[PDB]
């Protein structure tokens, strides 16, 4: 409250670190689906469906120009992506299933790096 914090956690690295992370992702084998943004004009369904589309380019232009407050900002538009994927695709497809595959390569990164 008022004049009374808890111990400052260091924070001075999260940049650096989320971009790591980011790379690896991106330098995944099955991070295909996800690379771009979902072309709207060529999918049918996705613009109307996915209220709030995400990927690792937007998440890429949105770390480097200093769009996420801070590190939590970041893994909620990651999880966006995985959340999106899973909406919209069956798990038993190869997106369907890169998106699981991803999403644990994630949130075990994000596991070791910070918690």
């Given at each position: 409250?008022?004049?009374?914090?808890?111990?400052?956690?260091?924070?001075?690295?999260?940049?650096?670190?989320?971009?790591?992370i980011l790379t690896e992702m991106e330098t995944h084998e099955d991070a295909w689906p996800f690379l771009?943004?979902?072309?709207?004009?060529?999918?049918?369904?996705?613009?109307?469906?996915?209220?709030?589309?995400?990927?690792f380019?937007?998440?890429?232009?949105?770390?480097?120009?200093?769009?996420?407050?801070?590190?939590?900002?970041?893994?909620?538009?990651v999880?966006?992506v995985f959340?999106?994927?899973?909406?919209?695709?069956?798990?038993?497809?190869?997106?369907?299933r890169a998106g699981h595959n991803m999403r644990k390569y994630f949130?075990k990164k994000?596991?070791?790096?910070?918690?």
């Open positions: 409250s008022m004049s009374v914090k808890k111990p400052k956690r260091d924070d001075s690295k999260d940049l650096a670190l989320c971009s790591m771009l943004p979902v072309n709207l004009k060529l999918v049918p369904g996705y613009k109307k469906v996915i209220k709030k589309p995400m990927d380019s937007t998440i890429r232009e949105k770390l480097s120009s200093g769009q996420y407050p801070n590190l939590e900002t970041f893994a909620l538009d999880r966006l959340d999106n994927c899973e909406t919209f695709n069956e798990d038993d497809s190869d997106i369907g949130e994000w596991t070791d790096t910070f918690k």
